[PDB]
Amino acid sequence: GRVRDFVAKLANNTHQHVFDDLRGSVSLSWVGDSTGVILVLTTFHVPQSKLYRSEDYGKNFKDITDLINNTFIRTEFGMAIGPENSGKVVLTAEVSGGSRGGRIFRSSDFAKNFVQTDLPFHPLTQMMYSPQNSDYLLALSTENGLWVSKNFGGKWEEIHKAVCLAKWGSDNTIFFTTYANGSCKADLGALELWRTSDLGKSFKTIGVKIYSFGLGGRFLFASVMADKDTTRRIHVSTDQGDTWSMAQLPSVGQEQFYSILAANDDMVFMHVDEPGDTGFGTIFTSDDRGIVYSKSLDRHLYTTTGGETDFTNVTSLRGVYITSVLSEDNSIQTMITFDQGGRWTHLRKPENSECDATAKNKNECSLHIHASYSISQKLNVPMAPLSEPNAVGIVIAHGSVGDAISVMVPDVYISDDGGYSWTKMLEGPHYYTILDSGGIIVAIEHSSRPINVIKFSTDEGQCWQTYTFTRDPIYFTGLASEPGARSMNISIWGFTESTSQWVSYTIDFKDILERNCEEKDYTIWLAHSTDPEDYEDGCILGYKEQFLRLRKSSMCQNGRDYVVTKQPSICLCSLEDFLCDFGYYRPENDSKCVEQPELKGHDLEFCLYGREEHLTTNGYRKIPGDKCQGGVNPVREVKDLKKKCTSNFLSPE
């Protein structure tokens, strides 16, 4: 344990609040950053709606149900909370069966005063704030009109009809799909993709034969129907639709799907579903254009039914992602990549962990991670893997140790180096959060039955101390805490036993970490270190990062203003910083990219109908987000591969 005098500190700081009876649908929303404002919304269906508010981080709520006029709020649309600190809150309310249109309750300041506005239409969707201006909203109506508002929902105007899907781009741009006749389901693949810069003053048709579309990073993606067929394929656009490239990705049937797994201004992770009811697909990573794709992972478990994947950005160390794959035998293994998908491997098992029945060898086994897929199978998993960018290196997850994901009741495992190494944090399932950029870690035992106790650790999970926060135990469902993992306030939620009420105990760790952190506590940490002795040690994507990192031994507060300190070393370029361009491959182990003897499959499709500027390749492209400098420069004098597809074909004219 190692902490002296904790019960004293936490006694004062434990704050209980009580709420009304089960069972009602419960919504909790944080409003703003550095505000402490929380909205709890409760709705009841029997032959109404309650709304509370707290400015103290959840220590004391007081009941503002007065401010909505006592009317009935609909949990379908929930609470549409404005971006950043704009403080916008919008609630959609239920109206009499035959009404003009719907009604919403608008707060422009952190839910202190609400104004009720009657809409000219009926909302089919939660209203969506424009990213650049929180005063801009768009909604889809039940008649499929696209409605827009410049004034934050006071006045609306219908800027197009027959709209399937509509999204805010950057700079108040709206992208939406329309349909000619029939219904969005009927005309699917026949959809038309539009853009409007001026909020409906003027439009442009950027797409046709559209199955679907989506945004990630700088890319606009659209899947387009074959003129000849039911197959579709991805086209990509960097200009917001003005020009369109066919991706080098396989086409799919109507059985299959694309999923954008992750996107950043450098690249995307694209999941392509496998033909047949596989339950798996292939992961591709793109180049910085989104045009050129590299096969990253085989048999990536993503289910056709319910849409579960285990795919996880480990957001506490750059380059690092974990995911599940379906082996040849039907068993699920976890895989981790440290280099942004350039290579996948098995997570290393804890030093002292021993293998389970899954493992065919008893001293030699991996760690496997419970994530969305596990949870969906009703395995005993209260939480998915957790990591925060402020807390460098830290990953917390339920797992098992063996050759595959085990159905047994999992322990909880922690990593401080971003997933290179692991130890058992806690035996048994737990709920966990991170406070104060890793200054504190907090855990609740997951029990079939009531708990009066919360666990906390100030050394990043190496040591734990038990605190009893209530002497009347609760049935415990969840933790609420301020997003961004910067506060010292945690809210334990649950209900009492039997004739009941929901309760929340919010604990301030304010005095548990009494003294502030200062330079002395931090220590120099090279990320991604494999071999100390090496010049190139810790180069990922062409460079190293050295971090200043809070000493495990130091017990103190990083503070709300804490800034991860790190400095880059820029590594010399090797071939391993380059990906094969179109029509090139690595045949041997050797990194070197050589010309393919000929194009096959979707390589041949791309070559046949492909956009011509990309056809000449350098054989080599710098991995996106790779910052390496100097060293090797294999990128080549451009060479036209157009003729080498068509050299086989007889040509006309």
Ligand X SMILES: Cc1cccc(NC(=O)c2ccc(C(F)(F)F)cc2C(=O)O)n1
Ligand Y SMILES: *[C@@H]1O[C@H](CO)[C@@H](O[C@@H]2O[C@H](CO)[C@@H](O)[C@H](O)[C@H]2NC(C)=O)[C@H](O)[C@H]1NC(C)=O
Ligand Z SMILES: *[C@@H]1O[C@H](CO)[C@@H](O[C@@H]2O[C@H](CO)[C@@H](O[C@@H]3O[C@H](CO)[C@@H](O)[C@H](O)[C@@H]3O)[C@H](O)[C@H]2NC(C)=O)[C@H](O)[C@H]1NC(C)=O
Q: Given the complex with ligand X, which of 257 and 476 has the nearer CB atom?
A: 257
**Shortest Cβ 36–ligand Y spacing (Å):** 5
Q: Of the candidates 417, 508, 577, 581, which one interacts with ligand Y according to CB under 6 A?
A: 508
Could you say which of ligand X, ligand Y, ligand Z, none residue 258 binds, taking C-beta under 5 to 8 angstroms by partner kind?
A: ligand X
* Chain residue whose CB lies nearest ligand Y: 487
Q: Of the candidates 111, 137, 263, 301, which one interacts with ligand Z according to CB under 6 A?
A: 263
Per the CB < 8 A criterion, the answer to whether 196 and 178 are in contact is no
389 scored as a contact of ligand Z (CB under 6 A): yes
In the shown chain, the binding pattern of residues 258 to 297 toward ligand X, with x for contact by CB under 6 A and - for none, equals xxx-------------------------------------
Beta strand spans in 302-417 (E): 312-313, 321-326, 332-337, 344-345, 347-348, 366-369, 395-402, 411-415
Q: Given the complex with ligand Z, which of 132 and 462 has the nearer CB atom?
A: 132
Q: Of the candidates 289, 348, 455, 560, which one interacts with ligand Y according to CB under 6 A?
A: 560
The structure tokens listed for 422 are: 């692991």
Per the CB < 8 A criterion, the answer to whether 300 and 283 are in contact is yes
Per the CB < 8 A criterion, the answer to whether 419 and 385 are in contact is no
The b/e string for 71-104 (b: 16+ C-beta within 10 A; e otherwise) is eebbbebbbbbbeeebbbbbbbbbbeeeeeebbb
489 scored as a contact of ligand Y (CB under 6 A): yes
Per the CB < 8 A criterion, the answer to whether 452 and 468 are in contact is yes
Q: Of the candidates 3, 14, 27, 56, which one interacts with ligand Y according to CB under 6 A?
A: 56
Q: Which residues pair with 622 in a beta bridge?
A: 578
171 scored as a contact of ligand Z (CB under 6 A): no
Rounded to whole angstroms, how far apart are CA atoms 640 and 595? 12
Rounded to whole angstroms, how far apart are CA atoms 182 and 161? 13
The structure tokens listed for 166 are: 């509509």
φ, ψ at 128 (rounded to 5°) = -125, 120
264 scored as a contact of ligand Z (CB under 6 A): yes
Q: Of the candidates 102, 145, 214, 542, which one interacts with ligand X according to CB under 6 A?
A: 214
Q: Of the candidates 220, 488, 541, 573, which one interacts with ligand Y according to CB under 6 A?
A: 488
**Shortest Cβ 213–ligand X spacing (Å):** 5
487 scored as a contact of ligand Y (CB under 6 A): yes
Could you say which of ligand Z, ligand Y, ligand X, none residue 528 binds, taking C-beta under 5 to 8 angstroms by partner kind?
A: none
Window of 3-11, 263-271, 342-350, 357-365 that interacts with ligand Z by CB under 6 A: 263-271
Tell how strand 245-246 and strand 232-237 pair up: antiparallel
Among residues 613, 519, 601, which one has the least CA distance to residue 275? 601
Window of 258-266, 323-331, 400-408, 611-619 that interacts with ligand Z by CB under 6 A: 258-266
71 scored as a contact of ligand X (CB under 6 A): no
Per the CB < 8 A criterion, the answer to whether 38 and 480 are in contact is yes
Within residues 400-459, the interface with ligand Y by CB under 6 A covers none
Query: Which residues of this chain interact with ligand X, rule CB under 6 A?
Result: 211-214, 221-223, 232, 234, 257-260, 307
